[PDB]
Amino acid sequence: LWDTTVRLSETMTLECVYPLTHNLTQVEWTKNTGTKTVSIAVYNPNHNMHIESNYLHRVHFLNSTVGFRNMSLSFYNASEADIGIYSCLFHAFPNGPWEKKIKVVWSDSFEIAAPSDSYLSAEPGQDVTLTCQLPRTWPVQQVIWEKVQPHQVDILASCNLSQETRYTSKYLRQTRSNCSQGSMKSILIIPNAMAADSGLYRCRSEAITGKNKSFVIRLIIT
């Protein structure tokens, strides 16, 4: 129901970068208040821009090297009412839409609730293998890989072997994931890792009983 969770802050940014090579035709930023949706912004490559009147002077598009591929939404002065789920919709007709769902939550640093269980050192330029030490059998229903930062948590992979539809990560940096039926090691691979790939990587299991387990790796790439 969400691809990225970011911490509520006065100048928070909802990252959204189109990862595909298709020619863009439109972006839309929406917030799902309830069942109804509020159209925050609509932008077209002809520089036509719709902005919802209540968001007139509340949001902007910093978007380093502005090229309409990066449409991350930044707040000037956010408040508790800005908590909720946002949708960032890229249209690249005829190729079809690419949607990233962002949930804003009231919280402290996400790293607080993710103390590292393992420390992983690796040299730059190598394919780093992250190993989840959590069991995958019943009652566990799905296993999720996330990158945990103080301000945001990005879902890198999600595997539910019973689900017929697969989960596609909206994370910009490429990773190698595998949702296989075998009883092998639950692995996430970071290809050609750099110093920017350092940080907390958390594998998370969700069970049919509702119980939540987590295993956190502190990856350090000098």
Swiss-Prot record:
Q: Which cysteines are joined by disulfide bonds?
A: C16-C88, C132-C203, C159-C179
- Which keywords annotate this record? Cell adhesion, Cell membrane, Disulfide bond, Glycoprotein, Immunoglobulin domain, Membrane, Phosphoprotein, Receptor, Repeat, Signal, Transmembrane, Transmembrane helix
Bilayer topology reads: Single-pass type I membrane protein
The yes or no answer to whether the keyword Translocase is present is: no
Modification note: Phosphorylated.
**Highest taxon of source:** Eukaryota
Q: What processes does the entry annotate via GO biological process terms?
A: cell adhesion; natural killer cell mediated cytotoxicity; positive regulation of Fc receptor mediated stimulatory signaling pathway; positive regulation of immunoglobulin mediated immune response; positive regulation of mast cell activation; positive regulation of natural killer cell cytokine production; positive regulation of natural killer cell mediated cytotoxicity directed against tumor cell target; positive regulation of T cell receptor signaling pathway
Q: Which GO terms describe its cellular component?
A: external side of plasma membrane
Glycosylation site list? N23, N63, N70, N77, N160, N178, N212
Q: Where in the cell is it found?
A: Cell membrane
Ig-like C2-type domain mapped to chain residues: 1-106, 115-216
Extracellular face residues: 1-222
Q: Which GO terms describe its molecular function?
A: identical protein binding; integrin binding; protein kinase binding; signaling receptor activity
Coiled-coil ranges from the UniProt annotation: none
**Observed effect of gene inactivation:** Deficient mice show a normal composition of lymphocyte populations in the spleen, bone marrow, and lymph nodes. However, they show increased tumor development and mortality after transplantation of Meth A cells. Moreover, Cd226-deletion mice survive significantly longer than did wild-type mice after the injection of various doses of LPS.
Give the chief site where it resides. Answer: membrane
Assembly and interactions?
Interacts with PVR and NECTIN2. Competes with PVRIG for NECTIN2-binding. Interacts with ITGAL; this interaction mediates CD226 localization to lipid rafts.
Function, in words: Cell surface receptor that plays an important role in the immune system, particularly in intercellular adhesion, lymphocyte signaling, cytotoxicity and lymphokine secretion mediated by cytotoxic T-cells and NK cells. Functions as a costimulatory receptor upon recognition of target cells, such as virus-infected or tumor cells. Upon binding to its ligands PVR/CD155 or NECTIN2/CD112 on target cells, promotes the cytotoxic activity of NK cells and CTLs, enhancing their ability to kill these cells.
- Name of this protein: CD226 antigen
**Gene, per the UniProt record:** Cd226
- Full-sequence range covered: 22 to 243 of 333
